[PDB]
Design an enzyme around this catalytic site. Structure first.
Site, PDB file in Angstrom:
ATOM      1  CE1 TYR A   1      -1.794  24.519 -19.857  1.00  0.00           C
ATOM      2  CE2 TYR A   1      -3.137  25.784 -21.368  1.00  0.00           C
ATOM      3  CZ  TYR A   1      -2.198  24.804 -21.137  1.00  0.00           C
ATOM      4  OH  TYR A   1      -1.661  24.104 -22.191  1.00  0.00           O
ATOM      5  CG  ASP A   2       1.911  28.506 -16.590  1.00  0.00           C
ATOM      6  OD1 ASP A   2       1.839  29.733 -16.374  1.00  0.00           O
ATOM      7  OD2 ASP A   2       2.368  28.029 -17.650  1.00  0.00           O
TER       8      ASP A   2
ATOM      9  CG  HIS B   1      -6.991  30.378 -23.959  1.00  0.00           C
ATOM     10  ND1 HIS B   1      -8.121  30.249 -24.735  1.00  0.00           N
ATOM     11  CD2 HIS B   1      -6.033  30.880 -24.771  1.00  0.00           C
ATOM     12  CE1 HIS B   1      -7.860  30.661 -25.962  1.00  0.00           C
ATOM     13  NE2 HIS B   1      -6.598  31.049 -26.011  1.00  0.00           N
TER      14      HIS B   1
END
EC number: 3.2.2.5
Lengths: 670, 657, 115
Positions: B121-122, B158
């Site tokens: 998620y970065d 995600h």
């Protein structure tokens, strides 16, 4: 493909099945009331369309055409070499990515390539977020091209520059050459277009060709229409409507040139574009010459006797200077009668030649030197100064050009002989004034001072030295004395043997007392000394003692030839001293008649002393291939030797079909 | 070190690298990026957040060790008990920070992937792509799948934090993992489709993770041995045991183990990531030619698809081998831009000596014989260093060239047995003057070529049919406008219905896109045919001719004479090559005007040079015995060329000059 | 006669000369010795000159890799000629041509056509 656009400036219908929207647009353009009929936003859109079409040059339908004019205007500093203005525009502070694109193009033009690479990288970084697809695509293209040019330059330099420059140069460091090699790893240009948003792929399809390895392949093949021979006998002008292939080819060339230079694309510096321009220009000029000759043949000479089918202007001059080397220019010069084509807009070409001279002076007077810029700039300067023979120059501009050519042009590319040839070519169209005479005198004085050093020695690739400069000086002004050279001679001394020899070649430019002093240092004592002085020393007159010495030599050689008859053996010969004496006697240089007794040794000598009684079956036609203009004119002058040489030359040209023999038999003799 | 790594590879590692590099070349490679790659650059791992949650939940800190289920349970309990605000407050506190990228991202992007799937998620890969300059569409939500700007995806399954630091945009607790298939239908569909139509490489995950096992279960249930096994790049301190290796290989995976290639200390994770990521993959983008049987295999793979055609131009071959060698028109090869094993040299050495040929194994001697026959027929002899006495010969076998009209009549009458015969019949009809039957036959051939084949006859038949259509349209335009006067009668060669039919049929066809629509196998095997649809196949020849003309004319103007060989021989050789290639492949291109002009100019130059050289024997042997004997004389091919490609005025000009 | 060194020989008709890449050793006046020498010719029909000058072509002599200046009589007797390939056929070919052609300095290294 709804419609067919033309360089003519008119449009035509083509495989369109529907409403004629373009014709309706032209109808709206013609009448103001119809433009009033439309709505408001539609009016603004119509104004935008009008601006665009007028700017790019679409006028009206083909049926509604007329005497449409045509002119080319390229609005770009790079195509005019306004180097200082480019530098100033670089130095200011930017305001938008478009100005940065322009700045990067100028930086790459000026030779500083690393700054161009960095600027293009920054532009690519910002543009993607700024949502400007066109500049992003074009900057990717230009950065890749700059990287390719950098790599090729590095390879060429490490291969040959250390030799040709005389010292290994390092225009780029190694950290940069490692960084860029790491970044551009496995980068392929062939998927750059396909990786963009499909909106871009729809709106900007016409730019796909900029990502291909080679473009201008249909244009080159289309040049075959200029090599047709049927047209002169019978031509329809099928190219478009009543436009010969010349016009279409030239306008296509201008379109490509303008599109590349205006939009600031870096493909203008590569080999393909230069080759394309070379081929197009050469073919156009050759076709024009052929048409002129055929028209002369069909009709009388007075019809188009010196007509120039092709007319040069500023644009043609700049293109030929930039894209042609010296060999290409000489090929065009030896293929067609370029002297018979007139040049126009000479003030602009004069303003172009002076700018080149000032740039040369700026580049080489200062210690700093941008080698990469100096290697992409010297070629254009050389070619322009070579092609400047055909245009008339003003006094001040001519002075600037001559000073730059004589004092500041680097010797590594323009040695003394090439300097002389380039300088002499300029005087054909313009008569030499006093100012340029003073400049060349200054150059001669400077070379005289240079000759103080013992190791110094002139090196020439064609055997032309300061003597030729002095002869050129004296040719246009019979009376002339160099005051600085005179006083230099007056302080001269014996031990300066190199200065002695150097200014022995400039006797006519010295003063009476100076030349008396100089001749006081040297003398002639033998035949070898006599011809050494005549060759280098300029012994104008055969003194009586010189003639007696010549007769003594001739009698000694008579005795030696008698002893040779006794021998019946002759090892080898190098230089025929007898022939020179015979020719001098024919040239009314030796007034004695004793050598007439000394006859029967050398067939050439007999031919040159008693032509009437000489046996001509021994004549060798190749003898004619060494004489110069004056000697051939003299041979034509005499009556005992005219028709026999006519016969031999005629026979040789019949059998050999040689051109030199035809030239001599036509220009001279009959 | 790298040389040692290249050396000790087993067969398995070599094969894996081969497949990965080939699939990267074809443009279908995909990376499944893990979490270790995002820890190489410092970024708070999940266990730190679990520790903070445990500290905030019970006054005590982390005790003992955490099992797999605790990571997903503790956040769930924290959310349930305290409230949402605390969850997202802690998330913002821990994740709001900028960190630098690491060399692994640059290497991954340098591998040139098509898509890139990630569970992170970065925004590290985003910055990597932006700096490298690549353009990817980011899909981290559900509404993003419908409106995608491009056709290459950066799929974060995600989630991400591009719409805020809320805990709803991501998948981090057991409830999120329970309702994934129901809350992310479109993303899961797209990920499965990408996996089922691409080559996948797993990086920085570690066996036994959640997603690996979930994907492995899906692969188990949802397939029938009709897919490509993914690859796995394992980077852990100790070498993998054999039992685990076989167990996971049997479960649909191919493992590459970093610790096996090179040895390193415990915490030197960057070292073992770099040892395998690119320093071994990209550097191995070159060939692996090291044997006397690999050379023949590679050359056969490169040359075989050209057996379908009849004759190949020598210059065109420079593109078949990707600028690795220069082929001269005379028939001598030269090295250029090739840095690996010299395979043409070894092929020539094998050709010279029979003993080396005997060393070739079974099943590879026949390939060598086929390659030898191909090269001998085309005309490639040897390298330029060992060049012998090269000769000049001309031979064209097409009946159309010699103008045997009765023979082609009889052949057209005769029954056909194969599509090649129909192809030749159509070409003969075109050179006989039946436009209608030629077009109909070409359409029938296009129809019948549905059966398995190379796609060569189909492609060339499309090209020829379009060319014939253009010819028909031009004839119609000329006939009714000028034919009325040429013969004084309105000659109606065509019925109106046929003209309407052909115009209707060919109104959409675009010859420009014909090549680009073909299957990628055809686009990678027959690339030398791409030039056949444009003027691009006469470019280099015309450029060379324009330069040679100027050179020769300058020489004649100087009056110089050379005592070597004629400087224009390349013109004649190229002319014959083009004539042979076009006529003996049954291509209508011979009827174009530009080809006629090219041949006319070449012949004019050759005749002019021959005439100039003829008369020198009087100014050469009339001064000294030294002289030359070589010359040029007209022949059968010269006569037919000058008959076909010249107008009367050109011949008159040559006669005058 | 037949050799691989003859493929670079060039004949120029405007001056009736042979151009070839070859180096010479020369004995001058039977007293001076020089090695690795050659000539360069320049064809010039229009040159500003006096009555002493009558030749279109001006020649220059180089020795070693340096210009050579000779004032005494240039009595020329060839003794050895070497071509890059080092074949010794040139040693007799040079004599054959020199006897064949009548003009002086039959073989040179470079020619410059000024017009």
């Amino acid at each position: 493909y709804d419609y067919h656009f033309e360089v003519n400036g008119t449009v035509v219908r083509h495989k369109n099945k529907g409403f004629g929207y373009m014709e309706r647009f032209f109808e709206l353009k013609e009448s103001c009331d119809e433009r009033s009929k439309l709505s408001k936003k539609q009016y603004e859109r119509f104004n935008a369309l009008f601006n665009f079409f007028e700017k790019n040059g679409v006028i009206c339908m083909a049926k509604d055409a007329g005497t449409l004019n045509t002119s080319i205007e390229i609005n770009s500093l790079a195509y005019h070499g306004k180097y200082d203005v480019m530098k100033k525009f670089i130095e200011e502070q930017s305001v938008s990515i478009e100005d940065d694109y322009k700045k990067a193009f100028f930086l790459a033009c000026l030779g500083r390539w690393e700054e161009s690479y960095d600027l293009y990288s920054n532009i690519i970084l910002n543009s993607i977020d700024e949502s400007n697809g066109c500049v992003y695509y074009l900057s990717q293209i230009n950065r890749y091209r700059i990287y390719q040019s950098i790599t090729q330059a590095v390879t060429q330099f490490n291969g040959l520059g250390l030799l040709t420059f005389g010292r290994h140069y390092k225009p780029f460091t190694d950290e940069f050459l490692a960084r860029i090699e790491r970044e551009m790893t496995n980068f392929n240009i062939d998927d750059l277009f396909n990786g963009m948003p499909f909106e871009f792929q729809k709106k900007y399809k016409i730019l796909e060709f900029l990502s291909d390895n080679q473009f201008l392949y249909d244009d080159t093949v289309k040049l075959f229409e200029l090599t047709n021979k049927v047209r002169s006998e019978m031509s329809e002008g099928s190219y478009s409507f009543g436009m010969s292939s010349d016009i279409v080819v030239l306008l296509r060339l201008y379109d490509n040139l303008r599109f590349l230079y205006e939009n600031c694309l870096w493909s203008v510096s590569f080999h393909e574009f230069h080759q394309y321009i070379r081929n197009s220009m050469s073919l156009l000029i050759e076709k024009a010459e052929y048409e002129r000759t055929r028209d002369i043949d069909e009709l009388g000479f007075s019809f188009f006797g010196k007509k120039s089918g092709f007319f040069m202007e500023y644009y043609d001059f700049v293109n030929i200077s930039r894209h042609f080397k010296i060999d290409d220019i000489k090929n065009l010069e030896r293929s067609c009668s370029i002297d018979k084509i007139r040049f126009g807009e000479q003030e602009k070409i004069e303003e172009y030649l002076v700018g080149i001279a000032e740039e040369i002076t700026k580049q080489f007077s200062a210690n700093g030197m941008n080698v990469v810029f100096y290697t992409q700039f010297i070629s254009e300067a050389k070619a322009a100064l070579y092609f400047a023979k055909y245009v008339k120059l003003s006094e001040e501009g001519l002075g600037k050009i001559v000073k730059a050519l004589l004092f500041y042009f680097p010797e590594r590319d323009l040695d003394i002989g090439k300097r002389y040839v380039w300088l002499e070519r300029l005087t054909k169209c313009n008569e030499l004034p006093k100012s340029i005479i003073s400049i060349i005198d200054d150059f001669l004085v400077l070379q005289a001072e240079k000759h103080i050093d013992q190791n110094y020695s002139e090196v020439s690739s064609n055997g032309l030295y300061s003597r030729d400069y002095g002869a050129l000086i004296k040719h246009f002004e019979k009376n002339f004395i160099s005051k600085r050279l005179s006083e230099i001679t007056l302080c001269l001394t014996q031990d300066k043997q190199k200065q002695i020899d150097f200014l022995f070649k400039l006797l006519p430019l010295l003063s009476t007392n100076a030349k008396s002093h100089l001749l006081s240092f040297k003398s002639v004592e033998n035949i070898n000394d006599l011809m050494n002085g005549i060759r280098i020393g300029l012994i104008d007159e055969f003194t009586p003692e010189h003639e007696e010495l010549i007769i003594e030599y001739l009698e000694t050689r008579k005795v030696n030839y008698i002893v040779e008859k006794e021998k019946g053996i002759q090892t080898f010969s190098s230089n025929d001293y007898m022939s020179t004496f015979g020719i001098w006697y024919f040239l009314e240089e030796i007034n004695n008649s004793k050598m007439e007794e000394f006859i029967g040794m050398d067939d050439q000598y007999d031919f040159f002393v008693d032509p009437e009684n000489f046996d001509y079956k021994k004549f060798i036609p190749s003898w004619l291939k060494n004489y110069n203009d004056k000697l051939l004119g003299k041979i034509a002058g005499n009556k005992h030797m005219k028709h026999h040489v006519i016969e031999v030359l005629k026979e040789r040209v019949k059998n050999s079909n040689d051109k030199r023999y035809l030239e001599i038999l036509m220009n001279y003799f009959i | 070190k790298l040389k040692e790594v290249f050396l000790m590879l087993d067969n398995n590692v070599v094969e894996c690298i081969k497949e990965i590099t080939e699939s990267s070349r074809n443009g279908k490679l995909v990376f499944f990026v893990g979490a270790g790659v995002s820890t190489l650059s410092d970024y708070p791992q999940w266990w730190r957040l679990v520790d903070k949650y445990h500290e905030e939940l019970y006054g005590s800190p982390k005790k003992g060790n955490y099992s797999s289920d605790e990571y997903l349970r503790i956040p769930q309990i924290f959310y349930n008990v305290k409230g949402e605000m605390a969850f997202d407050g802690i998330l913002k506190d821990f994740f709001q920070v900028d960190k630098p990228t690491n060399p692994i991202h640059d290497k991954i992007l340098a591998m040139n992937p098509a898509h890139v799937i990630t569970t992170n998620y970065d925004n590290l890969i985003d910055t990597a792509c932006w700096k490298r300059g690549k353009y990817f569409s980011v899909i981290s939500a559900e509404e993003d799948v419908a409106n995608a700007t491009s056709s290459r995806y950066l799929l974060k399954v995600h989630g991400d934090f591009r719409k805020g630091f809320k805990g709803e945009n991501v998948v981090l607790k057991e409830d999120d993992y329970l309702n994934y298939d129901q809350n992310y239908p479109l993303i899961s569909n797209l990920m499965k489709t990408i996996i089922a139509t691409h080559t996948i490489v797993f990086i920085g995950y570690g066996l036994g993770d959640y997603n690996i096992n979930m994907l492995l279960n899906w692969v188990r249930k949802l397939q029938k041995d009709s897919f490509h096994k993914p690859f796995f790049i394992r980077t852990d301190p100790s070498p993998i045991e054999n039992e685990t290796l076989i167990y996971y290989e049997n479960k649909g995976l191919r493992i590459i183990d970093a610790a096996s290639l090179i040895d390193s200390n415990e915490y030197d994770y960057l070292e073992r990531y770099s040892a395998v990521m690119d320093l071994l993959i990209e550097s191995q983008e070159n060939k692996f030619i090291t044997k006397d049987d690999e050379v023949i295999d590679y050359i056969y793979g490169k040359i075989s698809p050209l057996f379908a055609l009849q004759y190949i131009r020598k210059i065109d071959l420079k593109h078949v081998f990707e600028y690795d060698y220069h082929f001269e028109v005379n028939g001598t090869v030269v090295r250029h831009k090739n840095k690996g094993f010299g395979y043409m040299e070894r092929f020539f050495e094998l050709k010279e000596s029979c003993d080396e040929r005997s060393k070739l194994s079974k099943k590879q001697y026949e390939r060598f014989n086929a390659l030898f026959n191909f090269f001998e027929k085309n005309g490639v002899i040897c390298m330029a260093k060992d060049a012998g006495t090269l000769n000049t010969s001309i031979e064209i076998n097409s009946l159309a060239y010699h103008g045997k009209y009765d023979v082609m009549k009889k052949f057209i009458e005769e029954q056909s047995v194969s599509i090649e015969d129909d192809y030749k019949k159509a070409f003969f009809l075109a050179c006989l003057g039946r436009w209608e039957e030629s077009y109909d036959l070409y359409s029938n051939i296009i129809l019948n070529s549905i059966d398995e084949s190379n796609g060569c006859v189909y492609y060339l038949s499309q090209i020829n049919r379009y060319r014939i259509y253009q010819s028909i349209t031009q004839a119609v335009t000329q006939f009714n406008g000028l034919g009325l006067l040429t013969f004084g009668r309105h000659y109606k060669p065509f019925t109106d219905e046929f003209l309407a039919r052909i115009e209707r049929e060919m109104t959409n066809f675009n010859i420009d896109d014909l090549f680009n629509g073909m299957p990628f196998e055809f686009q990678k095997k027959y690339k030398i045919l791409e030039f056949l649809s444009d003027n691009q196949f006469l470019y280099d020849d015309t450029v060379k001719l324009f330069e040679l003309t100027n050179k020769v004319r300058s020489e004649m103007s100087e009056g110089s004479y050379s005592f070597g060989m004629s400087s224009d021989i390349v013109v004649l050789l190229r002319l014959y090559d083009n004539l042979r290639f076009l006529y003996e492949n049954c291509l209508w291109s011979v009827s174009f005007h530009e080809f006629h002009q090219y041949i006319r100019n070449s012949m004019s130059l050759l005749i002019e040079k021959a005439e100039y050289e003829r008369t020198r024997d009087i100014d050469e042997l009339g001064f000294s015995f030294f002289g030359k004997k070589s010359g040029f004389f007209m022949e059968y091919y010269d006569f037919v060329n000058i008959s076909r490609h010249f107008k009367i005025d050109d011949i008159k000009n040559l006669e005058r000059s | 006669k037949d050799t691989g060194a003859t493929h670079d020989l060039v004949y120029h008709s405007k001056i009736n000369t042979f151009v070839w890449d070859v180096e010479f050793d020369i004995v001058l006046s039977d007293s001076k010795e020089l090695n690795k020498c050659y000539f360069v010719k320049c064809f010039n029909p229009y040159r500003i000159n006096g009555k002493c000058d009558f030749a279109v072509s001006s020649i220059d002599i180089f020795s070693e890799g340096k210009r050579l200046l000779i004032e005494n009589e240039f009595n020329f007797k060839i003794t050895k000629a070497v071509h890059v390939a080092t074949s010794k056929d040139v040693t007799e070919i040079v004599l054959h041509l020199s006897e064949r052609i009548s003009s002086p300095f039959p073989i040179v290294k470079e020619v410059v056509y000024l017009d």
